[PDB]
Design a protein around this ligand. Structure first.
Ligand SMILES: [Mg+2]
Ligand SMILES: [Mg+2]
Lengths: 82, 40, 73, 140, 48
C-alpha cells in the first residue's frame, strides 16, 4: 500500500547508542568539580493519574520501538531454537 | 506527623549514579542452597 | 636517648590480633557477598552455615591468664 | 608448599581437635585447606578458624570422658590431613603430599618445646623469622 | 562446549573396550592428547 520505488542512498549509522565519540585533548572548562556539583529541579514522574491529550508515553515509546525494530530487522534472524 | 517526605530526600550529585534496591539486598535474593537442599 | 632497636616496627601488643580473627572476616565477607557483586569464596559457602564459636576471646582483650579461652587448646 | 606447613600446624599444634575422622570436622579442615591454597585466606585466619570451628555441644565435658590433660592422639589428624591433600588435587604426584606432611613433623620431633609456638612467629605477621629458623620449613 | 573436548570417562571406557571387545572393532581414547593429559589438573593451576 502506498508504494513507490524509492532510492534511499544514505541511512545514518545504527542506533546502538554506543559509538566512540569525537576525541579532544584540551577542554573548555578545566574544572571537573562542576560535574559533581551540578543539581537540577526535580523530575516528577507523575501528576494525578498522568493524563494527557497528546499521549506522550505511548506515542514516544512506539515511535522509538519502530525504528528500533527496523534496524534489528525485527530481531528475526538472531535467535535460533534452543 | 512526619513532615519530611520520602518523596524528596537526597542530594543530586550531578552525573554520579548510585544503586538502590527495590526490596532486599541482591545477595539475599536466590535462596537455592536451602531450596534445592545443598547444605552440609 | 637510647631505645630498643626495632621500636619503629614494634607491633601493637594489644590489638595486633583483631585483624586476623575469624568473626571479622565472617562479618566483612558477609556484607561483601550481600552486595550481589562479589562471588563468594568457598570457605564462606561453608562457614555460612557453621559459624565459629561464640565465647572464645583472646587474652589481650580479657586480661585473665586463668580464663580457659578455647574449648580446643 | 606453605600449605604443608599449615597442615602441620593443624595436625600437631592443636590439643584435642575432636575426632578427626568424623565427616564434620573433616569437612571443616578440607574447606580451610582449599582456602589456604589459592590465597583466599591468611594462614593465621584459617588456623584460628579451625580451632574455633563448631564441633559438639559441651565439648570440654565430653573431653573429660576421653582425655586427662586434653591431649588427643595424633594419628587421626595426620591421616585426615594427608587425605585432604589427596582428595583435593594439591599435588601432581600423589605421594608427595603425605611424604612432606610426614617428614616435616619428624624433623621437628627433635626440637626443644616442639609442639608449642610463639604466637607472633607461628604464622604470617609483619615481622618474620629468617628462612632457616622458620618452623616446619624445608630449610631447617 | 567444554564437556566434549575432555573425554571424561576415557580410562574406564578404554578398559571396557580392551577387555570385552574384539580388536577388529574397538575405539580407544588416548589421554595424552586429551586437554589436561586426560587427568584432573593440580589444584591452583587451571584457573578453575
Ligand atoms: Mg642524649
Ligand atoms: Mg637508631
Amino acid at each position: 500500500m502506498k508504494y513507490a520505488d524509492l532510492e534511499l542512498t544514505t541511512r545514518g549509522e545504527f542506533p546502538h547508542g554506543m559509538k566512540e565519540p569525537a576525541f579532544v585533548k584540551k577542554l573548555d572548562q578545566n574544572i571537573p568539580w562542576y560535574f559533581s556539583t551540578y543539581r537540577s529541579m526535580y523530575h516528577w514522574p507523575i501528576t494525578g493519574d498522568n493524563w494527557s491529550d497528546l499521549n506522550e508515553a505511548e506515542k514516544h515509546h512506539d515511535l522509538h520501538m519502530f525504528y528500533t525494530l527496523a534496524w534489528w530487522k525485527l530481531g528475526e534472524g538472531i535467535f535460533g531454537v534452543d | 506527623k512526619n513532615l519530611n517526605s520520602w518523596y524528596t530526600k537526597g542530594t543530586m550529585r550531578g552525573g554520579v549514579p548510585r544503586i538502590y534496591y527495590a526490596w532486599m539486598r541482591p545477595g539475599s535474593f536466590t535462596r537455592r542452597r536451602f531450596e534445592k537442599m545443598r547444605n552440609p | 636517648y637510647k631505645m630498643p632497636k626495632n621500636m619503629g616496627v614494634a607491633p601493637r601488643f594489644d590489638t595486633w590480633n583483631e585483624k586476623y580473627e575469624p568473626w571479622e572476616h565472617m562479618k566483612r565477607m558477609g556484607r561483601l557477598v550481600g552486595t550481589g557483586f562479589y562471588i563468594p569464596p568457598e570457605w564462606y559457602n561453608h562457614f555460612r552455615m557453621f559459624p565459629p564459636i561464640n565465647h572464645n576471646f583472646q587474652q589481650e582483650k580479657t586480661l585473665n591468664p586463668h580464663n580457659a579461652s578455647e574449648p580446643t587448646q | 608448599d606453605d600449605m604443608f606447613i599449615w597442615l602441620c600446624h593443624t595436625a600437631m599444634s592443636v590439643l584435642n581437635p575432636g575426632d578427626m575422622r568424623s565427616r564434620l570436622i573433616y569437612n571443616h579442615l578440607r574447606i580451610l585447606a582449599e582456602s589456604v591454597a589459592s590465597g583466599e585466606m591468611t594462614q593465621r585466619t584459617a588456623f584460628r578458624f579451625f580451632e574455633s570451628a563448631v564441633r559438639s555441644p559441651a565439648y570440654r565435658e565430653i573431653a573429660k570422658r576421653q582425655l586427662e590433660g586434653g591431649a588427643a592422639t595424633r594419628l587421626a589428624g595426620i591421616s585426615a590431613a594427608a587425605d585432604v591433600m589427596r582428595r583435593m588435587g594439591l599435588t601432581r604426584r600423589p605421594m608427595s603430599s603425605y611424604f612432606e606432611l610426614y617428614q616435616r613433623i619428624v624433623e621437628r620431633s627433635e626440637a626443644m618445646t616442639p609442639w608449642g609456638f610463639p604466637p607472633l612467629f607461628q604464622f604470617e605477621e609483619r615481622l618474620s623469622l629468617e628462612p632457616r629458623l622458620k618452623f616446619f620449613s624445608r630449610a631447617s | 562446549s567444554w564437556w566434549e573436548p575432555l573425554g571424561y570417562g576415557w580410562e574406564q571406557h578404554n578398559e571396557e573396550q580392551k577387555a570385552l571387545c574384539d580388536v577388529t572393532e574397538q575405539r580407544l581414547i588416548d589421554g595424552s592428547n586429551l586437554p589436561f593429559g586426560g587427568k584432573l589438573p593440580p589444584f591452583g593451576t587451571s584457573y578453575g
